[PDB]
Amino acid sequence: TGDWRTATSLYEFSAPDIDGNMVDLSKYRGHTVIVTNVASQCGKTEVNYKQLVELHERYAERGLRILAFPCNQFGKQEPGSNAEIKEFMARYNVKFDMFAKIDVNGDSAHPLWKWLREQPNGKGIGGNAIKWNFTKFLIDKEGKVVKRYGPMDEPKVIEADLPKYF
Template sequence: AVNYTQLVDLYARYAERGLRILAFPCNQFGKQEPGNDAQIKAFAENYGVKFDMFSKIDVNGGDAHPLWKWMKEQPKGRGTLGNAIKWNFTKFLINREGQVVKRYSPMEDPY
């Protein structure tokens, strides 16, 4: 819940300056996203989510989405314990030139 709250706040503060938040639900972590796309979107809307919510994907393993594979391979996208995503709400900051600037752990504030 705190992650949604933080992201909603960031989006409200910086969307006019060009910030875009792209959310990709994933059910690979404790089965926390078992619903279908409509159910997940409805749940997120309870927190005031107005940013882009995409279909559920895998972020680890052979079926990981190509975007996530690419982000994890970038020099600033690598995790401290390897490239695997450890838990939901891992965040990547990508600049206007399409470069990964920073990777945030789920517990790290994205401010």
């Protein structure tokens, strides 16, 4: 219906990429997806970027796609413009998909993230708030959330779940 409250998969949403081009996320139909909120000035920025890059290098050939959403809501650790953030990810040689900066919590949260927070059967009242930088969601080939991993779970925690969804 266009309402995030009614959506049942990743494929109902669209978001601008880091260059500002609108991306319809149905482009990921049939792929294994990780969605994560990122930041450049977090204690865990280096380990998350390094391990996300490693997962993409190991598993892109199996259809793994990583969608990274910058977000400045957690300690103001993503203060850069989109153009600044684009320059930053190359230091990690990021070749997965980078999106324009968004809010993930609160009144201005992007609708995809309003939906992600509700995933285990939320009633539309806010769900499980994103707690800090580098939360991750593993999404299956039908666009359904299958697991959430927190700021403290390094990306390599997702690895043993990946072959179930390739």
